[PDB]
């Protein structure tokens, strides 16, 4: 019932970068599709709150493990490919509308832990070059990823 009138579920996505300009790439549990962490907004939370909660529960990072460098101005939408829509579940979710955050990891790599949850959606991670996600992400997310990585590049590039 967070689903908008259009059928878009509000979501946050997270781009975590290190000092060298790599970004964190997470493996989805029990699969080999990779992606940036993303998660639903719950009833009553802001974007930022949902982001910090997803960040801790799926990546194991606390508010002091990172700093927010940037966030997307407006929402980015993607439609799920028609075959992926659960039509029988009312109200129907036909897509996601996302606010994206760029975070810098300010503490060491050992602070990451993808098993802080016992229902973890990600079972692995690695550092990849900044643009590698735009190619490797699943096709129906690529447009959003292109726009997000475009918006964030200046901030990340201004890390000497």
């Amino acid at each position: 019932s967070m689903i908008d009138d259009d059928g878009y579920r509000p979501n946050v996505g997270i781009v975590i970068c290190n000092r060298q300009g790599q970004v964190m790439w997470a493996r989805r549990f029990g699969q080999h599709s990779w992606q940036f962490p993303q998660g639903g907004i719950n009833p009553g939370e802001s974007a930022e709150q949902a982001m910090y909660r997803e960040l801790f529960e799926e990546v194991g990072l606390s508010r002091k493990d990172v700093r927010i460098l940037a966030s997307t101005r407006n929402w980015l939408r993607y439609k799920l490919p028609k075959r992926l829509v659960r039509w029988d579940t009312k109200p129907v979710c036909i897509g996601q509308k996302q606010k994206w955050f760029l975070l810098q990891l300010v503490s060491g790599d050992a602070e990451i832990n993808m098993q802080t949850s016992s229902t973890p959606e990600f079972d692995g991670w690695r550092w990849v070059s900044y643009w590698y996600p735009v190619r490797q992400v699943v096709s129906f997310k690529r447009d959003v990823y292109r726009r997000v990585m475009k918006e964030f590049a200046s901030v990340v590039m201004s890390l000497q």
């Binding site: 070059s129 900044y130 590698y132 292109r146 590039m157």
Partner: protein, 275 residues
């Protein structure tokens, strides 16, 4: 509107496209449409910058010709690519790691905004050229019609035979070129270089390429001329090379070390085209 740039490097005209932040698919039909100077943009070659395939590389790029086929010539367009990703803010690195149809390269953008390329270590073993000779000498004699000539030969990946000339304008490129290009002692032909030594760190050069003749810029020929001039004890380890197409700077500490070629890339224009 698809954004693009026009750039000039190694004496060639590139249309250069950011396909990292832009969603575009370069089918051979689109490419031929773009190559058309009245319907599209017009270019010698099309350089497309793409996200990398390998998480430890920064980019991938492809080169297409006007027929819409992908070209795989080693190091082709590397200077324009490196300057381009910097100009467009796709990266801020000075050492850019990139894959191409020919493999992986590391390109360095100098503080003068030239681009330096590792070309590998030259090879003078005649089997590797391949060259008909019993052992490697710093200089070889060859008969060429009525003439006798002295030459160095080396492999930069492809074969080269380099002659010291006293002036590249008073050099019979047009007559000696073809004769040495397909001479008996080159099983796979060879690029013939004509090298006027001005100073130990400044060469003028004209190159009669393998099966192509005179081109304004053959970077591997500049690498080759400098490599033999150094092996022969004639050149400093840092040589400016003046070709019809412009200027390259070669650097090489000699055997055991790789040879570096440095060259410019000119940003000519930006442009938009609707597809």
């Amino acid at each position: 509107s698809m954004q693009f740039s026009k750039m000039h490097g190694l004496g060639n005209d590139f249309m250069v496209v950011d396909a990292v932040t832009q969603n575009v698919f370069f089918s051979p039909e689109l490419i031929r449409r773009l190559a058309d100077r009245h319907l599209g943009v017009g270019f010698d070659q099309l350089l497309v910058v793409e996200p990398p395939y390998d998480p430890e590389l920064d980019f991938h790029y492809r080169i297409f010709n006007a027929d819409g086929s992908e070209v795989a010539q080693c190091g082709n367009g590397a200077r324009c690519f490196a300057r381009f990703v910097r100009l467009k803010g796709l990266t801020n690195k000075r050492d850019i790691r990139v894959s191409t149809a020919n493999g992986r390269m590391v390109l360095t953008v100098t503080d003068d905004d030239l681009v330096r390329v590792n070309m590998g270590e030259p090879n003078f073993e005649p089997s590797a050229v391949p060259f008909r000779a019993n052992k490697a000498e710093k200089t070889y004699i060859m008969r060429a019609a009525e003439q006798t000539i002295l030459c160095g030969v080396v492999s930069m990946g492809n074969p080269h035979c380099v002659i010291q000339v006293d002036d590249v304008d008073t050099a019979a490129v047009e007559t000696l070129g073809p004769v040495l290009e397909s001479h008996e002692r080159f099983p796979e032909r060879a690029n013939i270089g004509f090298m006027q030594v001005v100073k130990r760190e400044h060469i003028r050069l004209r190159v009669y390429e393998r099966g192509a003749g005179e081109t304004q810029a053959c970077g591997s020929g500049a690498c080759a001329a400098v490599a033999v001039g150094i092996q022969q004890g004639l050149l400093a380890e840092e040589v400016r090379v003046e070709l019809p197409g412009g200027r390259l700077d070669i650097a090489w500490k000699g055997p055991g070390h790789p040879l570096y070629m440095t060259g410019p890339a000119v940003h000519v224009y930006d442009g938009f085209i609707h597809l």
